[PDB]
Amino acid sequence: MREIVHIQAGQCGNQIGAKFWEVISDEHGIDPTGSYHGDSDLQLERINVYYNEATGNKYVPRAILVDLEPGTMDSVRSGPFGQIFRPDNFVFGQSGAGNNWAKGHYTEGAELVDSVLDVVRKESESCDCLQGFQLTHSLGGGTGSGMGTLLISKIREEYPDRIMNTFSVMPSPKVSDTVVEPYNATLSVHQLVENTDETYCIDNEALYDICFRTLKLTTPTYGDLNHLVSATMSGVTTCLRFPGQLNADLRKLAVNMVPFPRLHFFMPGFAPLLTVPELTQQMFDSKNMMAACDPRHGRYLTVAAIFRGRMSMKEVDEQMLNVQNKNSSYFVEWIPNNVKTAVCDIPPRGLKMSATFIGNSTAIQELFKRISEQFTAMFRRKAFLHWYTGEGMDEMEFTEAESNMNDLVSEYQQYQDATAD
């Protein structure tokens, strides 16, 4: 009964959104009709965090579905669990932003925004006690990126004492050719750094590389990538959704993971893609990060680790202690006890045991540096800029977004270089 309101915006947002609800409904024993046909009581104990209860034992996701392009929401509707989402919670526009951030943020998105807010408000006013909001979106397009970041800004104006949490999909030339995506990402980051409390960096580069290199998948579809996102999203929300020795909400996550308000971009990780020692080893390995950053190139500010399945807690405790000792240089020494472990009995689907990793690492600067290089390769030669000035954007707004992201990088560097003595 501490409620979360889920918002999915754009194609990516809506696709990863639908995957999330599929996997968590399956985990909570919820049908596509909305009925409980599970076996464990731990499934329903905190069900209200993500689901509304309408009578006849019907569980409806507290989810709002948004796009400037009407097609995508027919896919959700005529996918699995399309029958579960509230019909009034679908909000579609007409044109589609066509990969233009300025269109999603300032023009078309701005026109559709108030009708989304009406659905937010309706869901929010029925809440016993609102925790806040999770937005799924990409930063490369125009709706998820532009309209998503507008939505955040407007929601934050009406609910400034609530938590804003995102699952943001970072662009790679390895997945999409759309050349303008480094502009859309930089502009989005500029917003996210000012207006979210916590952001999960789902990096398409890392997902590609996991699929190609590790899983051996020769050509990665979005369906291959989203199998990674969904396993991760299932993992990171575990302590929100189940009772344990540690009961969590979005605010306690932020308080404990975010030592400085701008440094709220997390590297998620997953294992396996085993014995307890092996799982532990794997979750701290670069190959397992959902963000293309090497942890050994930075320092961990904070870490949260979730072990799932039936295993020895004593063993998990010793292995977690063990990995910190062996890797002591990669954890800042000025935040004592900065790695926290939780255990949940319910494994995810098809695995006996898993490990999900939430890292606030100064190595996330590699993600932002990559985006900043692709950004700067276009902006000094002014490429495709008319797409943005044509919507009424100033040129200084591009310069500002850029050096705010540059500041973020050097702030992540400052805390990396910092010592106790």
Binding site: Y106, T107, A110, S153, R156, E157, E194, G390, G392, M393
Partner: protein
Amino acid sequence: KREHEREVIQKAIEENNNFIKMAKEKLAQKMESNKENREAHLAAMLERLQEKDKHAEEVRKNKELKE
């Protein structure tokens, strides 16, 4: 001696009352200062977001005044 006895008990009452009094006022000053501080933190946040609404009005103006 009876005078001294009166003065001891009166001193006891006075110090006790002073403790209660100082505790009541310190708490009132802390709760007031806190309420003010929190209000100013939220007011600044809302002002920033207000500037974002004002800047977006300028962007939609700038687009139309291309014609």
